[PDB]
Amino acid sequence: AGKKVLIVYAHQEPKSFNGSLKNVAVDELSRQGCTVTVSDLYAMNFEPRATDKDITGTLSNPEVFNYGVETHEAYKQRSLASDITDEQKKVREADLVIFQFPLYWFSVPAILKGWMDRVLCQGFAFDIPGFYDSGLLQGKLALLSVTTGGTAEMYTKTGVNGDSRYFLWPLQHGTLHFCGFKVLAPQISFAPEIASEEERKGMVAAWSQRLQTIWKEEPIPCTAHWHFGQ
Amino acid sequence: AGKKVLIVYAHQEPKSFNGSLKNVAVDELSRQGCTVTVSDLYAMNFEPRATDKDITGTLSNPEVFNYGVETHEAYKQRSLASDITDEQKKVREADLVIFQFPLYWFSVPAILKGWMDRVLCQGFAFDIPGFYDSGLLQGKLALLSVTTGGTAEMYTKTGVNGDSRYFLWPLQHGTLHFCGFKVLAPQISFAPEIASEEERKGMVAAWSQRLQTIWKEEPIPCTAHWHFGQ
C-alpha cells in the first residue's frame, strides 16, 4: 500500500521559492509512487472569511450567530459549504499534510489561516473532549514548510526575532497537534531572497533530499519544552 | 491635544460577547471625549487575501509577482488599493489601536490576519531601517482584546493550552512591536460562553473600568522573557 499526501500551498507567484519547494515535493513524492494532491489556495481563490455562508441549512440559533456552534452542527448535518467539505475530503484521506507557505507576521498568510479556521471545524478535526493527543485527525502526520524573510541568526534565542520555534507554537501545538496530527520537524528555508542562487538551490535540494526519507521520520515532541526550552 | 482610538473589530454577530466588548469600548472612550473609529471587518467584508489586486497600476515587475515588493512600491507610489489605504489613514491618525477578536487557533481570525497582512505593509508599518523599537508606527499604543473558548486554568504554563503569553508572541512581538507599537497588557476574557451571566458582566465591566485609566497605563516590556521567562 502507498501513502496519500495533501500539500496546502499558499503563494501567489508560481515562479517563487515557495512554488519551487512545492513543485519539488510533488515531483519527489510522485516519484516515490505516492498519491499527491495540492491545494493552491490563491489559484482556487479560497475563502478565508468565516461567515454564515459556510452553512447551507437552517441555523441552529439564527438569533445569535455563533460560527463554532453553527459549523459543528452543519458538519454533522452535512450542511457545510462545498469548498469546506472538499478540503476535508483531501485531509481525511491524506496520510501526510504539508503546508507550503511564506512566513507572514510570524504566522501563516491570511488565506491559509482561513483554510485552517474553516476546514478544521469541530466534529471533523476535533471534539470536546477529543483534541491534542485524542484529536480526531490522530494518526496523520503534519509538516510545515516555511520560507522566511529574516536570516537564521535573526531566529535564535538571542536573535532580534527570537527562536524560530517560538512562532511555531500556535501552528504546531495550537492547531495541528490540537487536531490529533503528529508533527514532523518543520522545514524552514531561511531568507531565500537574501541567499545566493547556489544557497537557494541548496535549500531546494535539502527539501527534496529530506523527502526521500520522510516516511521513516519520527514526530517531534510537541511540548512547551520543545518550543521554549526551559 | 485629545486622543484618537481605532478599534479593529472582528466578529460576525453584534449580540456576541465580542460585540458587547466593542460597544462598551466605544461607550467609555466616547464618554471620555475621545475620537473613536471602528473597523467592523466582517461588516466591511474586508479582503484578507494578499493578491496583486492590492496594487493599482503597473506592477514593478509583472513577470514575477512579489507581494512585499509590489506593496512597498505601491505604498510609496500611492498605488495601493483604497480599502488598504483607508485603514492606513485610520491607523496613522490613531493614538490607540484596539483589536477585538475571539481566539481562532491560538491566533486572530483569518479576516483580521488579512488586515495585518495587507494594511501593515512595508513603507507604512515598517522598513529595512526601522522595525521593532524603531518601527514606523512607533509611539502609538496597541492592545489585544481577545476572548477565548478555553478557561484560564487551561492557559497556564502547566495547562493543556499552555501559558497565554505563548500564543501572544507572534501578535504582540512579531506584529505590533515589529511595527513600533507600544503594547499594553492584553485583555483576555476567558471562556465567556462557559461563564455565568454574572461572571460575564464582570468581564465586560472590568473592560470598561480598565478603559477609564488606559491612558495612564505603562506599555509591557515586550521581550521574549516576558512571554516565556520568569
Ligand SMILES: Cc1cc2nc3c(=O)[nH]c(=O)nc-3n(C[C@H](O)[C@H](O)[C@H](O)COP(=O)(O)OP(=O)(O)OC[C@H]3O[C@@H](n4cnc5c(N)ncnc54)[C@H](O)[C@@H]3O)c2cc1C
Ligand atoms: C505580509 C508579509 C509578512 C511577512 N512576514 C515576515 C515575518 O513575519 N518574518 C519573516 O522572516 N519574513 C516575513 N516576510 C517575508 C516573507 O517571509 C518572505 O518574503 C518569503 O518567505 C520569501 O519567500 P518567497 O517564496 O516569496 O521567495 P522569493 O521572493 O520568490 O525569493 C526567492 C528567490 O529565489 C528564486 N527562486 C525561485 N525558485 C527557485 C529555485 N527552485 N531555485 C533557485 N532559486 C529559485 C526566485 O525567483 C527569487 O530570486 C513577510 C512578507 C510579507 C509580504
Ligand SMILES: Cc1cc2nc3c(=O)[nH]c(=O)nc-3n(C[C@H](O)[C@H](O)[C@H](O)COP(=O)(O)OP(=O)(O)OC[C@H]3O[C@@H](n4cnc5c(N)ncnc54)[C@H](O)[C@@H]3O)c2cc1C
Ligand atoms: C475557528 C475557531 C477556532 C477557535 N480557536 C480557539 C482557540 O484557539 N482557543 C480557544 O480557547 N478557543 C477557540 N475557539 C473558540 C473561540 O475563541 C470562542 O468561541 C470565542 O472567544 C467566544 O467568544 P464570542 O464573542 O463568540 O462569545 P459568545 O458565543 O457570543 O458568548 C457570549 C455569551 O454571552 C452572551 N452575551 C452577549 N452579550 C453579553 C453581554 N454584554 N454581557 C453578558 N453576556 C452577553 C452571548 O449571547 C452568549 O450567551 C475557536 C473557535 C473557532 C470558530
Ligand SMILES: CC1=CC(=O)c2ccccc2C1=O
Ligand atoms: C516581520 C518581518 C521580519 C523580517 O525579518 C523581514 C525581512 C524581510 C522582509 C520582511 C520581513 C518582515 O516582514
Ligand SMILES: CC1=CC(=O)c2ccccc2C1=O
Ligand atoms: C483550540 C480550541 C481550544 C478550546 O479550548 C476550544 C473550546 C471551545 C471551542 C473551540 C475550542 C478550540 O478550537
Ligand SMILES: [Zn+2]
Ligand atoms: Zn503540541
Ligand SMILES: [Zn+2]
Ligand atoms: Zn516586543
